[PDB]
Write a protein that binds this DNA or RNA. Structure first.
Ligand code: OIY
Ligand code: OIY
Ligand code: OIY
Lengths: 117, 150
RNA sequence: GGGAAGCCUACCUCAAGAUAAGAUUUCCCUAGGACUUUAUGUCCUCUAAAGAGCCGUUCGAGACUAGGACGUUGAUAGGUU
RNA sequence: CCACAAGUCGAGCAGGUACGAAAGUAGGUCUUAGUGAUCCGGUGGUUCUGUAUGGAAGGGCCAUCGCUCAACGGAUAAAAG
RNA sequence: UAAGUUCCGACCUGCACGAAUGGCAUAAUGAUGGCGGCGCUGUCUCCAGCAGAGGCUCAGUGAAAUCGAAAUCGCUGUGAAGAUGCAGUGUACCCGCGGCUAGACGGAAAGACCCCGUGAACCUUUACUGCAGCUUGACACUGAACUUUGAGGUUCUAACUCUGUCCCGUGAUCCGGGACGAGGACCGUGUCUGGUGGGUAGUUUGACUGGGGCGGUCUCCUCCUAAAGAGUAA
RNA sequence: AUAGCACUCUGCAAACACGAAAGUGGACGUAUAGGGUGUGAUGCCUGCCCGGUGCUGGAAGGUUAAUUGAUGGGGUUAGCG
RNA sequence: GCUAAAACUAUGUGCCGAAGCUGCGGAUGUAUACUUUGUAUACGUGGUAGGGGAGCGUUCUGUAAGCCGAUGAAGGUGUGUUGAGAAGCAUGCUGGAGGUAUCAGAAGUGCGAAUGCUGACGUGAGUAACGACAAAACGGGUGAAAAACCCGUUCGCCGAAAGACCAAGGGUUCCAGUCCAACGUUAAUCGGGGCUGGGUGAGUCGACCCCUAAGGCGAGGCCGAAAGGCGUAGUCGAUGGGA
RNA sequence: GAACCCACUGUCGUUGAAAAGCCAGGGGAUGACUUGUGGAUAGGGGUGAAAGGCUAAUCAAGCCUGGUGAUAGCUGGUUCU
RNA sequence: GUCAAGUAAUUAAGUGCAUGUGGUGGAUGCCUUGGCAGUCAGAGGCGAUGAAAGACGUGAUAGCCUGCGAAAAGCUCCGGGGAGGCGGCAAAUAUCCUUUGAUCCGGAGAUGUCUGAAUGGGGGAACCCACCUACUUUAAGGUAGGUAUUGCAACAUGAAUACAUAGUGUUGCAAGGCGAACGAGGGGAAGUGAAACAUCUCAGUACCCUUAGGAAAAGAAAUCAAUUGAGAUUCCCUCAGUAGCGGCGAGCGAACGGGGAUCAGCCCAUUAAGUUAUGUGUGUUUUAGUGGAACGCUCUGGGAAGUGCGAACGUAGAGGGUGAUAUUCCCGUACACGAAAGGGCACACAUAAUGAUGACGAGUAGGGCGAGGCACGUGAAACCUUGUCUGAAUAUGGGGGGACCAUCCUCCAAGGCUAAAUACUCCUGACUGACCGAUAGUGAACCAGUACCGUGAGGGAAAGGCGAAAAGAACCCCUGUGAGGGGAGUGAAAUAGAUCCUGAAACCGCAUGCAUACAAGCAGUGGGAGCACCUUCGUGGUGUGACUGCGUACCUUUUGUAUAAUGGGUCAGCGACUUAUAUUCAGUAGCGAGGUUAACCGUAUAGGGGAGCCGUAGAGAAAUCGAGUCUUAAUAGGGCG
């Protein structure tokens, strides 16, 4: 019962090389280099699925800060005022409104400073 | 493997990986790492276990209606057509025939038929009892198998 | 306020790839159609400037280059006197 | 107490003793170091075994003897550069 | 010599010369070691010019070691402790050609120095244990006749020796047979046995250890280290 | 290495060497010869030590092998109890 | 970059901040109760050396005289799609004759490393080098093409060898015609290259032959477990003697 | 002092023209000389004017084939979920 | 309109990624006049009448292979067979042969150069040189025969030396050499293990030497046993890893008894069983061969054996081939026949010859000394062999029963022959495989022990595939009458076009789209504008990726590695926990106080075979006892149960 490895081995190598498409030089041509490149790409993706949430929260916070300072408040004071006013709109929606609807954001800031007062 | 007695090159200084023989199993054309030898594949089967398995097989055939009993099963002449018509009458065109003794005419008539074989009552085996579609057994052969108790 | 062969200048050379890409003088190019992707728009016809280079004769310039001079409206090289 | 192999303390029961009038005390010395496994042999004893049988030789069991095996859990009976 | 750790001569507290593992000298000899002088010079101050052969360019043929992959800068710091690749910062448009060797702990050879492995080989000896060789005695081959106080002495021939002479096989410095001569129970050989035996052979020659070696230590008892139960390392 | 020097062994079937032996070299030589060892032309020379190891020659006291097998001690049994 | 701080000390109110906690969706292990269930609840699910459990694919045997296949198998190359994974499924193109469900059974059953083995191909790089510094120039010829071939006219080098012979060694390399892929460190019309055909004439040259040296073998023979060692008579053996 | 036989110095060469050379100098060159042909000595053996030199580019024990897949408490490697 | 300030678009020397289309290369898949392992039955040799192995020749053309040998791809005879043939690479060509029977197949004859045991002498194998007879020739030759050594026999001759013997010669007969494994005998290691090493082990193994047969060896008790029983050798299963041996270490390791396979005894001088030759007869087997059933239509297709519809044979549905997959197309298969001539075996007679120089076993048994063999290493060491020295009794006798003695039991050494059961495979025929399918399987599928390397012994490769059929591309064009290509033609297919099935990867080109010449690092990852093509016109698909957060490969080894510590230039293919036996534990199945057979027989996975093994009882060193037993004076106590 002699077994020849060629078909299965070729299939595995071809799948790895297919996943390595678009990489530079030997990273998309040579099996050893390509295999090292695919594993590292997976590791990076696993880490960056966590990093993405932090990055987008930072972006929302920056935009909310800009809007609040246009309306005469700091970000921390506006967040505190909304908390005291019981508004539970999250930072994603707050930043969206800050970017796309200045009048509504002005109303929100007015509510926050009214609760602060 | 032929040859391979001498050390291919010296242990140190050449820059090659160290080697002891050209017929090393790592080398192309070298020996097989674990060379096979002729093997004996027979197993022991307990006497009672064999008999019980045959009894179970016969009972299962009976309750699945693949065993057909006949008072007598003989052919006048060694004619394949004669045997074929006889089996087509019983609707057992694919069958194993079991008789108390194997008549020469019956054996000759059955030799050329596909899916038909004829055996003595003392020569039944578990694989052949299962492989064929039906088992046509004479009453004398059934009595002999009863005495043997499978 | 004074105060050293030391620092910045001052002297010589390089220097706008200084992408912040600087300044001054002088010179050159001033035509028609079609169409839609209506615009430094895409295709046809016409036009080919001021200059630069290829090539050649060469150099007190030179590894190859680069740089300098000249090409009949001529002394650039060889020869001749 | 302890990996093992080992090591330590011990009331009490029976027999035979010594000293005490007696209740009693005594299974070495106030205690903790003074040591060496296994193999192979020697000596005393033995209601064990005993290669046909009776003996015997040899073996077993109980007590005991032969190590600076001190590199002291001891690779050989026997070994330097 | 201007200047002499070298050289020559002399001195002698010769660490640690010395008479055939020769002592002290010695003409000639030496591609032999050390020191000095004349001449001579690009050896040098200190390099210049020129000639040939490469280098460079063109046409033809066409290697090498190396190589995880590269979009392959400096500095200071950090860090498997000396960074192109990490941090901060400075500088930097893209790509060749001729040169250069400061770094890529550059290439080359599983470090030869050092240590370790109950590794190897060869050599030595008053290491251990065998054997060859040499040597001793007993028994066998191995006999006879006369003397003396188990042993000794004299004589003999017939076993045995001759790498002595003659004869024959035989055209023969081998060998065999025969006849002599000189020896002779010796020598020599077999078995057993004591001695000698680096000639030869197989092996051994401990561990801990602020590397290894040298030194010290290796088992048992007491105190401290030992952190108020036990135990606890150098 | 060498010529020269010295010590020592070797009486011939030589010592010595090769070989298991037969045999061969030494040598178709014979101590003015042959082997081993050291020193190294030549000139002047070459001192003291025999305790150690070795070699050579004595001595027949002590010790010692194979071989030999005098004595003593056991095993067994005819017999006697 | 910072000086009634963006430094230090004390106090207060907010906020940022992790894969920690919460929210939403999904998977999996253990246990309690549902007294089959595959269901709810509670608690768990970082891992080297190791231990335990469950699977995917590959080759072969039976099932299989079955099922799929020239209306196109295996293999190759794309695309789409499915699962937690090893992987599965469908189909376009290529290809041209085999493949094989299910359930069992057996293993030459899975590769990136071992200075691993075999073949192919890269980088260095069109880089170093083209093998004695005795030296070349021109006209004509042939030819697809001439620095190298042929003819001619000049120049230069060796001349105790870079000339002429013999032995040893080699074996057709000798001569003629024809060809230029490979071989020739470049081209080649040329060649010691390919192909085809020729060429070596002995009484006197050499060998053979007669003779022997060193040495070898050796009838009988001597010796040795065997194989064998030595050696007599002889018989070979030139590097020497013989028209 | 040529041929011939050697190998003292230096530059070059070191993926060489060459797995030991070229060039310029150097030593012996009638003798213990150089050299052709054919023989003898074979591996714990041979041979050595002696360096552990040489014995087919190999020598503190040649080469080849077998024991043999020697052993390695050492280093490396060990393949799907 | 000029000027100023601000800010878009526009380059690719080259490069990256994606896609398309190629080259190189030869993986993969499919395949096989090749290997590997067996079963059954044979056979077990060839050679002086010249072997194995070679050299050289031999053809109409003739290089290699095959065959053959100056009679040379063949000659003669007998038998078969019946239309083609002149061997293969390897086509064409010519001369030809053949129904007056060729080629081809089987049997028997003829010829059969040179070397090689090589044998007339020699020698560097395939060469040089001879002698003697008989016939033949006249010139310088031819034909045929003989000429080695050793051993034995006969005859003749014949020294020292008288008789003799040694020696010498002739004739006749025989032997030598080669080759697989198995057998018998003569010698005989070390690596290794003992965690070192010397006894020991490895191991009487490897290797060297001598010599048989189809087998060899052994064999008919001076043997075991221990109720007085068995009854010659050989092989297998148990007994049993037991009893023992052993630096009592590492290890080595029986026997008795039982179960099987096969069975067989016969003689020592008038002499047996048996064996070997030759001849005859009978039977069987083998070497060529002959006959041998039964299919059509239709669809797809280059081609049908494949689809659809019906039919026929079967003592034949084993296998192979034919343009894809055939019981009925071909070769075959089952079955029925067949032999001039030769060979093998079996049985029966005939004659030889052997057995068979030997008639009951003396330098023998036993002993002293040194060794060797027995599972047994000097041990309490019996028994066997003998190098050395000795040495009986002889049936009222002698050997053995594991030191030795007594008693009992048992056998008769110093003389022989003997089949089967057992061991093996160079070779022949048939059949088989959960064996390989060109890096595998033999080193070798192919002109392989070749090319090549080495003085030599010796070492030792790589290399398979057009197509069903060559139908292997007439002719035209470019080019040097080259190579190569474009048309044409053949073919189902030419991107099947000659190193030609398929045709992967590394590596190297061309084309299109986007990005890229002010910006510093494992080259990705999470975001994300623009552009191009497509488009279900989108909250879509494909390609690219300006700008931006984070981010120092993999393996190994380590306390710890981006480490400037190891390994890898890349791809493709290969490459490492196996096999046998024993034992223990766990799952699972059968049976259950029981479970189970081994060798072996068996037309054979069945059925027989109960010897043996495990469990069912412990204690003790043991004798012994036994639900108890050991220790003790103890019924106490205590240990194992
Ligand atoms: C021994 N081996 C012979 C040897 O060597 N002799 C030498 C030789 O002949 C030679 O010496 C050289 N030439 O070196 C000679 C000088 O002319 O001297 C002699 N010797 C002498 N010694 C002697 C001495 O002193 N006096 C007298 C006279 O007898 C001298 N000669
Ligand atoms: C065995 N035991 C005693 C025995 O019965 N026969 C053999 C006797 C041999 C014994 N060594 C005495 C002897 O004669 N030795 C010689 C010797 O070694 C040698 O001759 C020379 N000259 O040196 C050799 C040359 O070949 O020949 C041998 N003799 C030969 N006779 C043989 C023969 O004929 N065939 C085969 C081969 O054995 C030949 N060799
Ligand atoms: N539109 C474009 C048009 C362009 C224009 N037209 C130009 C043009 O078109 N130029 C064409 C150039 C093509 C090329 N240059 C020519 C070429 O190559 N000639 C080759 C000429 C000689 C050729 N070497 C010989 C040959 O083949 N020997 C083989 C060989 O011994 C061996 O084979 C292998 N493998 O080992 C053997 C095994 O079978 O078979 C042989 N042969 C066999 N054949 C047989 C067969 O089939 N059956 C039966 C049997 O006889 C078979 N054996």
């Amino acid at each position: 019962a002699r077994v020849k490895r060629g078909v299965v081995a070729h299939r595995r190598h071809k799948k790895i090389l297919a996943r390595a498409k678009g990489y530079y030089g030997a990273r998309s041509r040579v099996y050893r280099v390509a295999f090292q490149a695919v594993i590292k790409a997976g590791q990076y993706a696993y880490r960056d699925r966590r990093q993405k949430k932090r990055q987008f929260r930072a972006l929302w916070i920056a935009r909310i800060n800009a809007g609040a300072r246009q309306n005469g408040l700091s970000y921390s004071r506006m967040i505190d005022g909304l908390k005291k006013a019981q508004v539970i709109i999250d930072r994603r929606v707050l930043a969206d409104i800050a970017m796309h609807d200045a009048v509504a954001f002005a109303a929100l800031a007015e509510k926050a400073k009214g609760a602060l007062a | 493997v032929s040859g391979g007695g001498k050390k291919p090159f010296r242990q140190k200084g050449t820059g090659r990986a160290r080697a002891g023989s050209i017929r090393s199993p790592i080398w192309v054309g070298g020996g097989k790492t674990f060379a096979a030898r002729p093997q004996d594949w027979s197993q022991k089967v307990n006497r009672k276990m064999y008999r019980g398995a045959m009894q179970c097989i016969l009972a299962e055939l009976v309750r699945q209606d693949r065993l057909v009993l006949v008072e007598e099963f003989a052919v006048a002449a060694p004619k394949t057509k004669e045997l074929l018509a006889k089996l087509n009458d019983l609707n057992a065109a694919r069958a194993l025939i079991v008789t108390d003794a194997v008549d020469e005419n019956l054996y000759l008539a059955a030799r050329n038929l596909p899916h038909v074989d004829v055996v003595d009552a003392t020569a039944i085996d578990p694989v052949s009892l299962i492989a064929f579609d039906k088992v046509v057994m004479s009453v004398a052969a059934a009595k002999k198998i009863e005495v043997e108790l499978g």
